[PDB]
Amino acid sequence: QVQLVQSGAEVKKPGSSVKVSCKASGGTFSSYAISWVRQAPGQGLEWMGRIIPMFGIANYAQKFQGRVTITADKSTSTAYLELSSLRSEDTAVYYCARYMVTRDQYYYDMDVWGQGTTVTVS
Amino acid sequence: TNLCPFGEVFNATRFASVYAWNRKRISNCVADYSVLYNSASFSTFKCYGVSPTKLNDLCFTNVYADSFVIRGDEVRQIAPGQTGKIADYNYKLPDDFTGCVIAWNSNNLDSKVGGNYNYLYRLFRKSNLKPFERDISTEIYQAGSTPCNGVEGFNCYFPLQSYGFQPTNGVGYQPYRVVVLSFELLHAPATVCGP
Amino acid sequence: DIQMTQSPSSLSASVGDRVTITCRASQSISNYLNWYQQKPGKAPKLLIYAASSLQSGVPSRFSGSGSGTDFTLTISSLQPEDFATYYCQQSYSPPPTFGQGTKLEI
Ligand SMILES: *[C@@H]1O[C@H](CO)[C@@H](O)[C@H](O)[C@H]1NC(C)=O
After folding, report:
1. What CA dihedral angle connects B168, B172, B177 and B181, to 10 degrees?
2. Angle value at C-alpha B160, between C31 and A112, nearest 5 degrees
């Protein structure tokens, strides 16, 4: 049912920060986690951080902790990633995806993915 | 002079889920308990330290209406004296409560075709909660020597599980709303009595 | 923390063929692993949310297996629907690292 829709592509100068977003449709963040994944072009997928909009709690993988922040406003059904200090090696396609952190004692089964945002530099 | 907010407690369409149970408090008003007992739709009116028909003629310091939603086959837990996930971790009444528990089938009001994951109950805690304790904390519950670092995984659980109230549920799997009217007497400088 | 590896990098196949793929984990996992596919330039979709448990709406074309490590995914009567790249991903301890991926050519 719930369909994520995702912000259009971001072109930015190196180091200068970026912001991207996902918002739900046919529902809202009903105590799901939403979490962010890089598809760097032709590399494996990489996981950035959890947020649970119902509680505002968020956490990050070690590689992105400090560089990135993720946030949400549940009443407007919208979650955001913003990344500082960018393009060490980075121009990835960014995906948000949900996973049902209250449905079972099983996690990170990302059953719905956003359309993907290209985020890149020149 | 004034008439009590029972008319809204039983007609607010938005209720919190049991782990975050709502409290509303009654003061300076006419408490018509008896018209509650005249209700068409109710599915329990089991009371403790009282029989509900007579209540109207009594007087009280305070009353709390505490309110939430529960899976029907575990509605039995809410009253005193029995362990079970709700009474263990979400909402425990005293050793000697005094008050009444009111509950009704809510599937026509509360169900959604996906399961309504806005409804949540705590199912892990380090120890059981004390009478009318409340806990909306959601830091990861450990299940091994693993320090979970505040993030979930094997042996590292998010404390709240959803009920998943689908329309296709049997009589007991359905959502039942609950209100617990908790009473108080004392030396009795009352502002709550029935007509 | 955990590391993933996945084999081979690519395979050729045919429509109606049967094909099998593997993923391996550097700490044991007690079957906390998932599988996804993505078409070239589109969103990933989840096929399996344990060793074997298939996800809703997915056709019977897929099955998965494993026990603590050395997992596999199989295609039976392979389709143009299966031209996708496939990824494993461990769920046993954060962060939930994904595999390097594998390519199927029809
Ligand atoms: C709740 O709403 C119904 C329908 O409008 C009304 O008849 C009733 O008096 C209200 N109050 C209670 C306590 O049921």
Report:
1. 180
2. 60
Helix (H, G, I), strand (E, B) or coil at B9: helix
Query: What domain range includes position A50?
Result: 3-121
Q: Which residues contact A81 (CB under 8 A, 6 or more apart)?
A: A19, A20, A21, A36, A48, A68, A69, A70, A94, A96
Domain count, chain C: 1
Q: Distance from the CA of A54 to the center of ligand 1, in angstroms?
A: 31
Residue nearest to atom 13 of ligand 1 (CA): B7
The residue among A55, A57, A7 whose CA lies nearest residue A31 is A55
Find out whether the beta carbon of B41 lies less than 6 Å from any atom of ligand 1.
Answer: no
Tell if the CB–CB gap between C44 and A111 is shorter than 8 Å: no
CA atoms within 13 A on the CB side of C79: 6
Q: Scanning the structure block, which residue is given the tokens 């692993």?
A: C33
Residues 6 or more apart whose Cβ sits within 8 Å of residue B128: B83, B88, B89, B92
Ranges of each domain in chain B = 1-114+167-195, 115-166
Residues of chain A with C-beta less than 8 angstroms from the C-beta of B157: 105
Q: How far apart are the first and last CA of chain B?
A: 10
CATH at residue C64: 2.60.40.10
Q: Backbone phi, then psi, for A85, in 5-degree steps?
A: 60, 35
Resolution for this experimental structure (Å): 3.9
CB < 8 Å to B114, chain A:
1-2, 27
Which residues, 6 or more positions from C57, have their beta carbon under 8 angstroms from its beta carbon?
none
Nearest-atom number in ligand 1 for the CA of B9 is 13
d(CA B193, CA B119): 34
